[PDB]
Amino acid sequence: CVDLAAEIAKHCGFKYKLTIVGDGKYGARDADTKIWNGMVGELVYGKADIAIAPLTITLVREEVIDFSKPFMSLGISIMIKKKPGVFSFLDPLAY
Amino acid sequence: IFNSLWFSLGAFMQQGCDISPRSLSGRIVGGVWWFFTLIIISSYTANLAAFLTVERMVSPIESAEDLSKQTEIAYGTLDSGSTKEFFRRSKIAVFDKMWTYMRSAEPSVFVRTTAEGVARVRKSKGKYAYLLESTMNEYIEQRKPCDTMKVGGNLDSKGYDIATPKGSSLGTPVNLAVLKLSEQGVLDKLKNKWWYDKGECTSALSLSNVAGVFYILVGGLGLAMLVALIEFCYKSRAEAKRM
Amino acid sequence: EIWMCIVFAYIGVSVVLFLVSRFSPYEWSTNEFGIFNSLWFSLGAFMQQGCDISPRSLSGRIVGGVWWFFTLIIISSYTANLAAFLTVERMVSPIESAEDLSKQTEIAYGTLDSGSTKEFFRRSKIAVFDKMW
Amino acid sequence: MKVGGNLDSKGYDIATPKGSSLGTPVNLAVLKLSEQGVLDKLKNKWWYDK
Amino acid sequence: GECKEKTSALSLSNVAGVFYILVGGLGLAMLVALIEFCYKSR
Amino acid sequence: TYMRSAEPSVFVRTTAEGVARVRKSKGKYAYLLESTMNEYIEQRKPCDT
Amino acid sequence: DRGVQMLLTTVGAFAAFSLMTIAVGTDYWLYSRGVCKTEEVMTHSGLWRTCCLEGNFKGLCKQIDHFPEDADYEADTAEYFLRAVRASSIFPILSVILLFMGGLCIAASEFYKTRHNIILSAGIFFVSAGLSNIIGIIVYISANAGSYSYGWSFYFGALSFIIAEMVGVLAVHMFIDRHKQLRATARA
DSSP, X not given: OHHHHHHHHHXXXXXXXXXXXXXXXXXXXXXXXXXXXXXXXXXXXXXXSOBOXXXXXXXXXXXXXXXXXXXXXXXXXXXXXXXXXXXXXXXXXXX | OHHHHHHHHHHHTTOOOSOOOOSHHHHHHHHHHHHHHHHHHHHHHHHHHHHHHHHHHOOOOOSHHHHHHOOSSEEEOBSSSHHHHHHHHOOOHHHHHHHHHHXXXXXXXXXXXXXXXXHHHXXXXXXXEEOOBHHHHHHHHHSTTOOEEEESOOSSOEEEOOEEETTOTTHHHHHHHHHHHHHHTHHHHHHHIIIIITOOOOOSOOXXXXXXXXXXXXXXXXXXXXXXXXXXXXXXXXXXXXX | OHHHHHHHHHHHHHHHHHHHHHSOGXXXXXXXXXXXXXXXXXXXXXXXXOOSOOOOSHHHHHHXXXXXXXXXHHHHHHHHHHHHHHHSOOOOOSOOSHHHHHHOOSSOOOOOSSSHHHHHHHTOOOHHHHHOO | OOOSOOSSOOOOOOOOOTTOTTHHHHHHHHHXXXXXXXXXXXXXXXXXXX | OOOOOOOOXXXXXXXXXXXXXXXXXXXXXXXXXXXXXXXXXX | OOTTSOSSOOOXXXXXXXXXXXXXXXXXXXXXXXXXXXXXXHTSTTOOO | OHHHHHHHHHHHHHHHHHHHHHHHHOSOSEEEEEESOOOEEEEEEOSSEEEEOXXXXXXXXXXXXXXXXXXXOOOOHHHHHHHHHHHHTHXXXXXXXXXXXXXXXXXXXXXXXXXXXXXXXXXXXXXXXXXXXXXXXXXXXXHHHOOOEEOHHHHHHHHHHHHHHHHHHHHHHHHHHHHHHHHHHHHO
C-alpha cells in the first residue's frame, strides 16, 4: 500500500502521514452499541482522512464510507500441500 | 543336491533348463513347482499392473467440485470471518453441500487463526486443505519452505478498494487515480513485483522404480566373481603344493 | 534411461559370465561359454527364449540366477506399465500458461488488431509480459 | 477451451449518468444480487447451463 | 449427512492354496518314491 | 439443460413412441416417465426394458 | 596375432581411462535449468558443480549442495545412504582407480613375462571397473530423479564402460592363450 499510497499522493500532490490502527482490526458492525471500531470507525469519526489498505468492498462499509473502484480482484481459493524405495519392485507381494 | 537347486531356480525364473527330471516322483515335484511358479509370477505381474493403473488413475484435486465429491482429504475455513458466512448464504449445489461437511465433522476443522491453519497444512502432508483468499494465497505459496500451492480458480469474486469518507474532496480524484494506475500498468507491475520478484521460490517407469533389481544384479555379479577367484586360488594352491 | 541401463547390464553380464566360465585353467574346454556364446546366452535369457547351454559352475550359475531375476522383474514391469498406459488415457495440453507461451515459439498467438487487449500489453513492466511483447 | 489464467484484472458494470439519482439504487441492487448469488446464477444460466 | 479401485500388496491368504497344493505334491512324490523303493527291495 | 440444446430434439409427442424410440436405439436413448405405469411396460413382451 | 592384440589392449585401456577421467572431471553430464549462484536459466551440471549457460550469470560454476537440509528432513536411512554415495561420487572414482590399476598391470606385464597370473588380474580389474561404472551411472540417475538432456561428458562415461569391458574380454582371452601355450609347450 505504501508504494500505492505514494502514487496516489504523487498524483494528487499532497503530503501523507502513515499510521497504524491501535486495535489492529479491519472494522465490523456491532449490534449492542452500534459503534464502529477499527479501520471502519477511523474514517467515520474523522480520525482518518483516507484509508489505503486491503479493505474488502462490502455492503456494510460501502453505504457509509465511499469506496473507490477495486484496484485488486480476489476470491476464495484452496491451499494444499504440494521417491520410491530402492526395493519397491517387491511391493506387489507381501514379505 | 546342487543340480536340484539349479533346476528349481531355473523353473521359478521361467528360464530354460539343461536337465529335467525323468522319474515319476521327480516329475511330480517338477510339475507342482511349475504350477506354483506360473501362479506366483502371474500374480506378481497382475498386482504390479494393478498398482501402476491405480497410480495412473489418481487425479489430483484442481477445482472445488472435484474436491467436494471426495472425502479423503479434509478441509475447512477460519473460525470466523466472511468465509464461513459466504458458505451459509451460498445456495450453489457445489457450495450448499460445502457447508454441510464441517457442520457434521469431528474433529472441528475450523481454525482459530490463519497462521495456525497454514502451519497445520504443512504437517498434514496433503491430508488437509485450507480455504482462504486468492491474493494472500500466492504470498504464502511464495514463502519458504515453498510447500503449499494454490490450485484452481477463485470460488467467488471480491475486491479491495481505497476507502474515503463520504462527502470528501479526495473521493473522485483517488478513483480516477486508481483507474489511471490500473490502465498505466504501474498497479499491475507493482502487484507482480512484490509477489514474484520478492518471492522466495512422469508416465513412463523411471530408473528409481527398478534400481533395486540393478543393485541386486551387480551384487550377484560381484559375488560370483569373488567365488570364482576364491575357487581358482584354492585349486592353484592345492596343485602347487602337490607338485 | 532404463533401456540404456538394460543394454549396459546385458553387456556387463555377458562379459562377467564369459570371464567366470573360461578364465580358470583347471576347467579345461569343458563348457561352451565363449564371449559369443555368453552374449547369446544373455540375450536369450533376457528375451525368455532359453538356450542350448546353461552354466555348470557355481559362479556361472550365480550369474545366471541374478540375470534371470533381473529379466523377470524388468519384463514384468514393462508389461505392467504398458497395461497401465493402455488402460488410462492421459492428455496434457502443450501450453498451460502465458509464460509458457512466451518460452515457446512454435505456436503463434495474438490479440485484437485494435482493442483494449492490444493497448494493455504495451505499458507492461512485468518481465513475463515484457519479453513476449 | 480456456487455458492459463487472467493476466490482467478488469470489471464489468452498469453505466449511469454522472450524478444520476437512479445510479445509486442500481449499484446497491447490483450488490444485493451478488451476496444472494443471483448474479453468478445468471452467469451460469447464460454461460454454463445454456 | 455425516457420511472401488483400490490396490494393496498380495497377502499369503491370497495364494495359500497354491502353497498347500505344492506341499501336497511334495508329499505325494515322497510317498511314491518310497513305495517304488519298497517294491524294488521286496 | 440437455434437450433445450440438443440435435435432434429428444422430446417425444406420445409415451408409446418414446418407448419405441428406446426399443430402437439399442440402449443409447432413455425416457422419463411415471414409475408405476413404467413398471407395467417392463412386464410386457419382449421384456427389453 | 599376439602383438596386434597386445597393442589393441593397451590402446583400449588408455582410451577407456582417458574417457572416464574426462567424464569425471568435466561438467557436461546433464543439461537442466537451475538457480545460479545460490533466476531460472538453462545450465549444465556435472558431478561436483554446475555452470550456468546463456544467462546473466553465465560462466561461473557453483557447487551443488548434495544435502538439501533447508527443510531439515531425513525421511528414511536409504535416502541418506544414496545421497552420501552420490555426493562422494565413490563409484565413478573407484572406476577410474580400477581402470588405472588394470592399465598399470597391463604395462607391467611386459616386465614379467613368466608370471602369467597378472594379466588375469588386469582383466579382473577391467571387468570390476566396468561394473563400478554401471553402479555409478545407476546411482547418479537415481539421485537426479529424486525437461533435461545428457551431454557428451556423460556419454563419455557410457562409452568408457563399453571400451573397458571390451578390453577385459581381450585381456582374459590372453590368459587363456598363455595357459594354452604353457600346456602345449609342456606337452611337446
